[PDB]
Write a protein that holds these residues in place. Sequence first.
Motif, PDB file in Angstrom:
ATOM      1  N   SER A 117       0.825  -1.206   0.000  1.00 46.64           N
ATOM      2  CA  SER A 117       0.000   0.000   0.000  1.00 46.64           C
ATOM      3  C   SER A 117       0.859   1.257   0.000  1.00 46.64           C
ATOM      4  CB  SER A 117      -1.012   0.020   1.156  1.00 46.64           C
ATOM      5  OG  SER A 117      -0.434  -0.414   2.383  1.00 46.64           O
ATOM      6  N   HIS A 118       2.087   1.142   0.523  1.00 42.34           N
ATOM      7  CA  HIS A 118       3.070   2.205   0.402  1.00 42.34           C
ATOM      8  C   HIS A 118       4.310   1.654  -0.249  1.00 42.34           C
ATOM      9  CE1 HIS A 118       5.817   5.443   1.363  1.00 42.34           C
ATOM     10  NE2 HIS A 118       4.748   6.177   1.620  1.00 42.34           N
ATOM     11  N   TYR A 119       4.893   2.414  -1.176  1.00 39.66           N
ATOM     12  CA  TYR A 119       6.045   1.918  -1.939  1.00 39.66           C
ATOM     13  C   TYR A 119       7.296   1.609  -1.101  1.00 39.66           C
ATOM     14  CZ  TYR A 119       8.804   6.204  -2.038  1.00 39.66           C
ATOM     15  OH  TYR A 119       9.588   7.278  -1.681  1.00 39.66           O
ATOM     16  N   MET A 120       7.395   2.229   0.076  1.00 40.67           N
ATOM     17  CA  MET A 120       8.596   2.052   0.903  1.00 40.67           C
ATOM     18  C   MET A 120       8.781   0.649   1.451  1.00 40.67           C
ATOM     19  SD  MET A 120      10.701   4.528   0.882  1.00 40.67           S
ATOM     20  CE  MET A 120      11.648   3.745   2.162  1.00 40.67           C
ATOM     21  N   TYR A 181       6.208   1.673   9.798  1.00 40.05           N
ATOM     22  CA  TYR A 181       5.500   2.788   9.211  1.00 40.05           C
ATOM     23  C   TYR A 181       4.488   2.271   8.187  1.00 40.05           C
ATOM     24  CZ  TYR A 181       4.766   6.864   6.174  1.00 40.05           C
ATOM     25  OH  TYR A 181       4.201   7.854   5.407  1.00 40.05           O
ATOM     26  N   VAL A 196      -5.155   1.035  -1.559  1.00 41.72           N
ATOM     27  CA  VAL A 196      -4.714   0.724  -2.902  1.00 41.72           C
ATOM     28  C   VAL A 196      -3.334   0.092  -2.851  1.00 41.72           C
ATOM     29  CG1 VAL A 196      -4.241   1.651  -5.165  1.00 41.72           C
ATOM     30  CG2 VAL A 196      -6.103   2.590  -3.755  1.00 41.72           C
ATOM     31  N   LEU A 198       0.016  -1.374  -4.679  1.00 46.79           N
ATOM     32  CA  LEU A 198       0.791  -1.255  -5.894  1.00 46.79           C
ATOM     33  C   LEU A 198       1.006  -2.630  -6.506  1.00 46.79           C
ATOM     34  CD1 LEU A 198       3.252   1.440  -4.693  1.00 46.79           C
ATOM     35  CD2 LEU A 198       1.167   1.762  -6.107  1.00 46.79           C
ATOM     36  N   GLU A 202       5.283  -2.993 -10.435  1.00 46.58           N
ATOM     37  CA  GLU A 202       5.762  -1.724  -9.888  1.00 46.58           C
ATOM     38  C   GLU A 202       6.695  -2.013  -8.728  1.00 46.58           C
ATOM     39  OE1 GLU A 202       5.702   1.157 -11.077  1.00 46.58           O
ATOM     40  OE2 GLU A 202       6.003   2.589  -9.428  1.00 46.58           O
ATOM     41  N   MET A 206      10.523  -1.121  -8.067  1.00 44.97           N
ATOM     42  CA  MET A 206      10.939  -0.497  -6.830  1.00 44.97           C
ATOM     43  C   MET A 206      12.188  -1.169  -6.260  1.00 44.97           C
ATOM     44  SD  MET A 206       9.368   2.200  -5.894  1.00 44.97           S
ATOM     45  CE  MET A 206       7.738   1.805  -6.547  1.00 44.97           C
ATOM     46  N   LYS A 209      15.234   0.004  -8.203  1.00 45.90           N
ATOM     47  CA  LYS A 209      15.566   1.390  -7.861  1.00 45.90           C
ATOM     48  C   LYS A 209      16.237   1.508  -6.504  1.00 45.90           C
ATOM     49  CE  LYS A 209      13.127   4.810  -9.498  1.00 45.90           C
ATOM     50  NZ  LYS A 209      13.426   5.066 -10.931  1.00 45.90           N
TER      51      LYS A 209
ATOM     52  N   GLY D  30      12.860   9.676   2.439  1.00 49.52           N
ATOM     53  CA  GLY D  30      12.100  10.061   1.258  1.00 49.52           C
ATOM     54  C   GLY D  30      11.578  11.486   1.286  1.00 49.52           C
ATOM     55  N   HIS D 100       6.784  12.255   4.147  1.00 49.57           N
ATOM     56  CA  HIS D 100       5.942  11.058   4.297  1.00 49.57           C
ATOM     57  C   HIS D 100       5.382  11.142   5.698  1.00 49.57           C
ATOM     58  CE1 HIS D 100       8.639   8.769   1.171  1.00 49.57           C
ATOM     59  NE2 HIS D 100       8.395  10.021   0.820  1.00 49.57           N
ATOM     60  N   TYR D 133      -0.885   8.440  -9.346  1.00 50.82           N
ATOM     61  CA  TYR D 133       0.305   7.686  -8.974  1.00 50.82           C
ATOM     62  C   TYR D 133       1.385   7.706 -10.052  1.00 50.82           C
ATOM     63  CZ  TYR D 133       3.719   4.244  -7.684  1.00 50.82           C
ATOM     64  OH  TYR D 133       4.914   3.643  -7.379  1.00 50.82           O
ATOM     65  N   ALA D 134       2.629   7.915  -9.609  1.00 46.74           N
ATOM     66  CA  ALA D 134       3.768   7.625 -10.459  1.00 46.74           C
ATOM     67  C   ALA D 134       4.932   7.300  -9.553  1.00 46.74           C
ATOM     68  CB  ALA D 134       4.103   8.785 -11.378  1.00 46.74           C
ATOM     69  N   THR D 135       5.888   6.555 -10.078  1.00 43.26           N
ATOM     70  CA  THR D 135       7.058   6.099  -9.315  1.00 43.26           C
ATOM     71  C   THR D 135       7.809   7.285  -8.728  1.00 43.26           C
ATOM     72  OG1 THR D 135       7.281   4.318 -10.972  1.00 43.26           O
ATOM     73  CG2 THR D 135       9.087   4.619  -9.409  1.00 43.26           C
ATOM     74  N   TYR D 136       8.265   7.119  -7.489  1.00 40.78           N
ATOM     75  CA  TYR D 136       9.027   8.170  -6.844  1.00 40.78           C
ATOM     76  C   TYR D 136      10.185   8.583  -7.753  1.00 40.78           C
ATOM     77  CZ  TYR D 136      13.290   5.648  -5.523  1.00 40.78           C
ATOM     78  OH  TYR D 136      14.514   5.032  -5.522  1.00 40.78           O
ATOM     79  N   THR D 138      10.376  10.336 -10.441  1.00 40.60           N
ATOM     80  CA  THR D 138      10.217  10.383 -11.890  1.00 40.60           C
ATOM     81  C   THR D 138       9.602  11.690 -12.391  1.00 40.60           C
ATOM     82  OG1 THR D 138       8.030   9.358 -11.860  1.00 40.60           O
ATOM     83  CG2 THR D 138       9.966   7.885 -12.046  1.00 40.60           C
ATOM     84  N   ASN D 159      -0.002   6.851  -2.626  1.00 34.28           N
ATOM     85  CA  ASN D 159       0.811   5.750  -2.111  1.00 34.28           C
ATOM     86  C   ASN D 159       2.197   6.220  -1.700  1.00 34.28           C
ATOM     87  OD1 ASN D 159      -0.973   3.170  -2.677  1.00 34.28           O
ATOM     88  ND2 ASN D 159      -1.005   4.448  -4.480  1.00 34.28           N
ATOM     89  N   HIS D 160       2.262   7.482  -1.293  1.00 36.82           N
ATOM     90  CA  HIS D 160       3.587   8.109  -1.125  1.00 36.82           C
ATOM     91  C   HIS D 160       3.647   9.108   0.010  1.00 36.82           C
ATOM     92  CE1 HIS D 160       7.327   9.904  -3.322  1.00 36.82           C
ATOM     93  NE2 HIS D 160       7.397  10.075  -2.013  1.00 36.82           N
ATOM     94  N   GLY D 161       2.974  10.239  -0.120  1.00 34.49           N
ATOM     95  CA  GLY D 161       3.081  11.268   0.914  1.00 34.49           C
ATOM     96  C   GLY D 161       2.447  12.571   0.538  1.00 34.49           C
TER      97      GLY D 161
END
Lengths: 211, 211, 211, 211
Positions: A117-120, A181, A196, A198, A202, A206, A209, D30, D100, D133-136, D138, D159-161
């Motif tokens: 739900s969070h990319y981290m 977190y 949601v 990911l 994706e 991640m 990256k 982040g 975040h 949404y898009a990848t951090y 980018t 999904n980020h902050g």
Amino acid sequence: GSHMASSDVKQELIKYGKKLVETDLTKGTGGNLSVFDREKQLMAITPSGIDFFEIKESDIVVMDINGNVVEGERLPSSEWYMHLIQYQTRDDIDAIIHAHTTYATVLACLREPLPASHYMIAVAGKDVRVAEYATYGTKELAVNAAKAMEGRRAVLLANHGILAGAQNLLNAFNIVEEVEYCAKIYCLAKNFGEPVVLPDEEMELMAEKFK
Amino acid sequence: GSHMASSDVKQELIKYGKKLVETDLTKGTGGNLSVFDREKQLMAITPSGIDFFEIKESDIVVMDINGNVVEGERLPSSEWYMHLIQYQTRDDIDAIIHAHTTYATVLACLREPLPASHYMIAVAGKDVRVAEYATYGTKELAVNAAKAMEGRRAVLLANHGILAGAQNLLNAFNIVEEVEYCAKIYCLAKNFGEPVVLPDEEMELMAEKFK
Amino acid sequence: GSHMASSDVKQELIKYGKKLVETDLTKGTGGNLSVFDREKQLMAITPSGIDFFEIKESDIVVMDINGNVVEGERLPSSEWYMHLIQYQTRDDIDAIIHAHTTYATVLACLREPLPASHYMIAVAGKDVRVAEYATYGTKELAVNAAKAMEGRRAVLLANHGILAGAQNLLNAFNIVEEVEYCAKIYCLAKNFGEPVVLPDEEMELMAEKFK
Amino acid sequence: GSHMASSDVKQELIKYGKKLVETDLTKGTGGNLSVFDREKQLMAITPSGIDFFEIKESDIVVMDINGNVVEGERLPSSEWYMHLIQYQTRDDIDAIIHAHTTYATVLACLREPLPASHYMIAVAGKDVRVAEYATYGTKELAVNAAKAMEGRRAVLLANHGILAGAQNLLNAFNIVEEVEYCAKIYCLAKNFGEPVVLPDEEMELMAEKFK
Ligand code: NI
Ligand code: NI
Ligand code: NI
Ligand code: NI
Ligand SMILES: [Zn+2]
Ligand SMILES: [Zn+2]
Ligand SMILES: [Zn+2]
Ligand SMILES: [Zn+2]
């Protein structure tokens, strides 16, 4: 006189023990930290039932790869075998932290995995699994945790807490912090609606990256 | 000149009073601590309506087993009889902490017991019960709490808070902390789904391991 | 040279301003404190839009009962009339704190009152009402708050925060703290199940015990 | 010798970086801060992957309007283009903070906007939108954030902050703090019932009062 775990590593275990309490990730109870020296094949681990703020270098227990204590008069953490079996089975993990955090432990008590739900969460993997329940401090828990952490850098321990591993304690600590977190975000999102998640593609991106 | 509660015990009550606020378990209001000296048969207890950070040794009230004040000019905690009746009826409890914590009090206001969703509850028992409601500071509350804490080291006080007891203040404090943590985990898990509760057999095992 | 609000009262406003941030009740934004001197018929109030940690004695604004500024070059809190109308209409309130706390403000944004799920609400009354919504800093808000605080020592301000009053700032602060705690307990209990609310008769008893 | 971003601005980035951790808005991971000097047309931004408490003035990266690094040997924040595109497209924003946080990120992970359940959201606008949404790190994220922040001073990143901007860092920080507070109030209210949302007309009034 050079054959055992260094002063540096012992002090570092103490430092990160304290950091876990200072940042309020845990109070320390049932929590433990270890490092594995690959050249020496020795694990250094925190002792059982000593407050993190009262641990001295002499309380750190040093063990060989089969769990024979070679330094320290204190009893090692009750979870020493949960740490040791990771080092026995994984070459990519040289430091491990076990903690009873908040939302990660919520998920563990539901026996619910943590998705992206969070990319981290990519610091640990595309998701974090929940190990089969076993009594604290047992071989069964150690084996259950090893298996459920395969392909990941963290795992939830059913009705218990979290285990994370990395190349060193700084990174292991960062994983605990980030997984806690992410667990929190996921749980709080579940209260409101449908988080949601990911997609795996994706998350595969991640992972690359994050390297 | 040796017949009353020691300076050591008074200072310790003050220390743990402060620890309850420092760790944010409570602000202190309506909270109280006591110790019972078994050789002397005296209870030392915190005074009523004094901020934990303003309590001096001379504010500690010392009482005999029938509640007759023998040292201190301050009024004792309004809950003095809730503490005293425990010492009268249980030989296994020498220190007691009452606090208005967060999630433990949530459960108390729902009048919902705390089950073994996390194994650490074994510091208090297989579960923590909720006492029948009675007005703060009354005999009814004292009796209700005694009864509902039978066979346990903690009890929830309906619409009020928590009471915990142990062999000494360090252990009593640890029980408050751990029961509050378990209450929190349980409540948060309930928001997400159905908390998994460990079976009584596993909790019986937990009790034996904790000894 | 003795006709205005004392240095003592100004310093005390500053002290409690800081206490609100130190204890994490609020960050300070939109929050304000005042005291009313009954002999002098003067209100001293915090200034508008100054961080609580940057307020000096010279920033405190002193007003007469009709809102005419008699000391201070700073603009008074935008909520000065919400405080002043209380002092105009109630003889039992000599200090007031307005804050944007957490769970009390949750209830305010739901426009939901706070009932006696915890007995400590008796510091404010059997329940805490929610005032009719009006724009911050307006006469309408001041009047709405006065009316909805009648017979109580605290009131929720719709979509806004909390207002509490007492005989002095220490007691006003205690009310804010306790009402925020009760709001939190009530909200958290609502997540789990149906909070048990103490009956009015018990709360009437509570009022008499609290005197 | 006067052509680059001042020492003052660099030190200020460091100060606010620390403030984000000190106030527990974020751990820092982040997260990033920047300022834009309009006369010089230079952005100063925090560096990538350095703990906020370890950032020195020499780690701050200074870039021209097209993203060419002109001062600093460190790699700039991975989000440098998300900041830069704001400065390229908006004349009303001279400082930006990305964080975040907790409840703002909950909303972001639900991909749910934040409405005016609390009036203080007017520091950012009548509501805060969620970007696609898009990848951090980018261009897609930078563009998505620019578009979804149009007409606002904050935006949620799916999904980020959160991203916020203002005339200076103090105000940008205040927006992050206030939007996080509003997000929290909204989420907590949703758990209890239906948050009451202030109408657009009232929020239009709020905007004018806030000027
Ligand atoms: Ni050696
Ligand atoms: Ni004596
Ligand atoms: Ni005078
Ligand atoms: Ni220059
Ligand atoms: Zn453990
Ligand atoms: Zn109590
Ligand atoms: Zn306000
Ligand atoms: Zn980010």
